[PDB]
Structure 1
Amino acid sequence: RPNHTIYINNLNEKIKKDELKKSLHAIFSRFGQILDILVSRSLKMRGQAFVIFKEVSSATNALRSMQGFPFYDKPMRIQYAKTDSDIIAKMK
């Protein structure tokens, strides 16, 4: 079910955290307000990202018209976050 935050994996793992962060914000902003965007390069969390929209509809729109996008030479695999983000839970 639809959720403010989207989960993206299959990201290029050779890309630095700073770079990936601005590059994600640049292609997703055109869909709505973005509270924050979580990115780690751990063993467990690499290749993936979380993008938090302020509106649930923005998430949905982004998921749909961006799925499979060639992001850094690698199709994106956007899906909904299985759980709500901290920023959102401690907000509403």
Structure 2
Amino acid sequence: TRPNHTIYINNLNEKIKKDELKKSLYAIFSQFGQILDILVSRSLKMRGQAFVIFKEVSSATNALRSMQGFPFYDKPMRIQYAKTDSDIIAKMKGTFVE
């Protein structure tokens, strides 16, 4: 609930292949700012989810506000801030601990 560089997206369509999903998330979410990375896995724990990492928290906050509920492959997107900093954010900060 507290703003973050990374947004967490769930309720994604699980049928969509990994590169396609990264691709289509990039298209939609660059409109709000510079993206450092989009992480997708199709494993059991991680399917249906993506982390979009932005350079600025303000882009993240605007991306979260605007896209909340957005129809994406026949499913509304659920978006939150990530609970924890993404490794590349934390290393940028010197906050990083293994």
TM category, shorter? over 0.9
Q: CA deviation at 1:61?
A: 0.1
Alpha-carbon offset, residue 49 of structure 1: 0.3
Per the normalisation by structure 1, the TM-score is 0.99
Q: Secondary structure at the match of 1:83?
A: coil
Q: Which deviations, in whole Å up to 9, do the C-alpha atoms of 1:20-46 show, x marking residues without a partner?
A: 000000000000000001000000000
- Segments ≥4 residues shifted beyond 2 Å: none
Report the number of matched residues.
Answer: 92
Q: Deviations over 1:52-85 (max 9, x none)?
A: 0000000000000100000101000000000000
Percent of pairs with identical residues: 98
Larger radius of gyration, structure 1 or 2? 2
**Separation (CA, whole Å) in 2 of partners of 1:63 and 1:88:** 18
Aligned-residue Cα RMSD (Å) equals 0.3
Unaligned runs of 5+ in 1: none
Give the C-alpha shift of residue 4 in structure 1. Answer: 0.3
TM-score, normalising length: structure 2: 0.93
Please list every run of 5 or more consecutive structure 2 residues that lacks an aligned counterpart in the other structure: 94-98
